[PDB]
């Protein structure tokens, strides 16, 4: 199977801005590649075929090219009904094989987390098991690392982080980082606190509390 | 010129089977193809196979060769794929695409949900509120299949609210949160309730929050 590479999983534009989406196909596939959109709920939309051609419909703004290996879908002059998913295709060789997809968000102002920490409910102390959950609220850019110290000693396999998809209204970002711990463990221990970076941050915040209150 | 349109989404039993169907409308001539592609919730496209209208050919991904069987009608201008013995791996919407001349078309997509033998309810705990807006919300920990569907004070509470994506623990099991932001001067005058329901299990979990 040919594997088609998409190593930018998030872009970031504004409206009139230019865009290019890589594509890197691990064997030759000539120039039968082919380029969609989709939009969350829409089905795709194809807008390239042989790297550079155009699809019925598809404005003059979408320039493919490439050839070989590397392949790119060009949006000059970024229109807001632009902001989508985009994935390119090999048809050159069996199995056709799709890319992993591009995501085209919209560029705004750097907006720092509003960070919030959540001690385990002494409901869910009665189940064995302790969680604790560290909100990043409404930030921007994507990138965001949370660390979990507890009693100032590094996490590390038992922590999950989930992000919401960016915000039609004000284009930021949320995370919740969930710590999962035994209610024994978490009742031997007495700080718990999450680690926040973040490009708007101007120094890293740690939101934190004491068991106990 | 041409209009796909796919049959209705699928609800249906693990080791069962369904036949999905795809017509053309639009065509006068035969000499057209059918490509049918797999999507899973949240991940990228899949090619399945295609079917030549003109004289019924056949290309099969090969490993769906056993899961789908690709046949076509040109009396009612449809397509069909049938997808056997249905796992969990089956649960996605399915596509049908096609070309015509220098255009391009899509189906509507067609969803098909293979329920799960084993289904768990969520649990919803509280995220009680311990500068002057302060956050609020429900854990939903350890359900199973998905979808859940979060509500904040049987929706007169939208604004602020975060419901994450699900994250699939360690145990098979589902776990997200659903989370608002308020002005902190509410916490002592607004009730805050979470409104879950997760349908496989018929669980309507409404959960009070207060800090
Ligand atoms: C997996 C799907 C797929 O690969 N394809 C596809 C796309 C949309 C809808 C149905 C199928 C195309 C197959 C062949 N085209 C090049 C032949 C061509 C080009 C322009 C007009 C008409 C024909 C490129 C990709």
Redesign the interface.
């Given at each position: 199977d040919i594997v088609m590479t998409q190593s930018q999983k998030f872009m970031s534009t504004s409206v009139g801005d230019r865009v290019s989406v890589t594509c890197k196909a691990s064997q030759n596939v000539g120039t039968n590649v082919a380029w969609y959109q989709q939009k969350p709920g829409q089905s795709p939309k194809a807008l390239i075929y042989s790297a550079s051609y155009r699809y019925s419909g598809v404005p003059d703004r979408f320039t493919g090219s490439g050839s070989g290996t590397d392949f790119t879908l060009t949006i000059s002059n970024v229109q807001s009904e632009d902001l989508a998913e985009y994935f390119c295709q090999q048809y050159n060789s069996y199995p056709l094989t799709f890319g992993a997809g591009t995501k085209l968000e919209l560029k705004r102002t750097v907006a720092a987390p509003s960070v919030f920490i959540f001690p385990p409910s002494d409901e869910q102390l009665k189940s064995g098991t302790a969680s604790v959950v560290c909100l990043l609220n409404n930030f921007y850019p994507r990138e965001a690392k949370v660390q979990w110290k507890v009693d100032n000693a590094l996490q590390s396999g038992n922590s999950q982080e989930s992000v919401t998809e960016q915000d039609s209204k004000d284009s930021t970002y949320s995370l919740s980082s969930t710590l999962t711990l035994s209610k024994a463990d978490y009742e031997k221990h007495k700080v718990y606190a999450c680690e926040v970076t973040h490009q708007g941050l101007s120094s890293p915040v740690t939101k934190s509390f004491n068991r106990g209150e | 010129q041409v209009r796909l349109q796919q049959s209705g989404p699928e609800l249906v039993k693990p080791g069962a089977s369904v036949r999905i169907s795809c017509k053309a409308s639009g065509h006068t001539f035969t000499s057209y193809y059918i490509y049918w592609?797999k999507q899973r919730p949240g991940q990228?496209?899949?090619?399945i196979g295609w079917i030549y209208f003109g004289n019924i050919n056949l290309?099969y991904?090969?490993?769906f060769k056993g899961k789908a069987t690709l046949t076509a009608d040109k009396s009612s201008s449809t397509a069909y794929i049938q997808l056997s013995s249905l796992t969990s791996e089956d649960s996605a919407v399915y596509?049908c695409?096609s070309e015509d001349?220098?255009?391009?078309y899509?189906?509507?997509?067609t969803l098909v949900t293979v329920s799960a033998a084993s289904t768990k309810g969520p649990?919803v705990?509280?995220?009680?509120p311990?500068g002057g807006?302060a956050?609020l919300?429900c854990?939903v920990?350890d359900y199973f299949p998905e979808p859940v569907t979060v509500s904040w004070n049987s929706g007169a509470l939208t604004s602020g609210v975060?419901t994450?994506?699900?994250?699939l623990?360690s145990s098979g099991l589902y776990?997200?949160?659903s989370?608002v932001?308020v002005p902190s001067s509410s916490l002592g005058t607004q009730t805050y309730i979470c409104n879950v329901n997760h349908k496989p299990s018929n669980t309507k979990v409404d959960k009070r929050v207060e800090p």
């Open positions: - | 592609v990228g496209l899949e090619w290309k991904n090969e490993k596509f695409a001349g220098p255009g391009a899509w189906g509507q997509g649990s705990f509280p995220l009680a311990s807006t956050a919300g854990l920990k975060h994450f994506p699900a994250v623990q776990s997200l949160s989370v932001t």
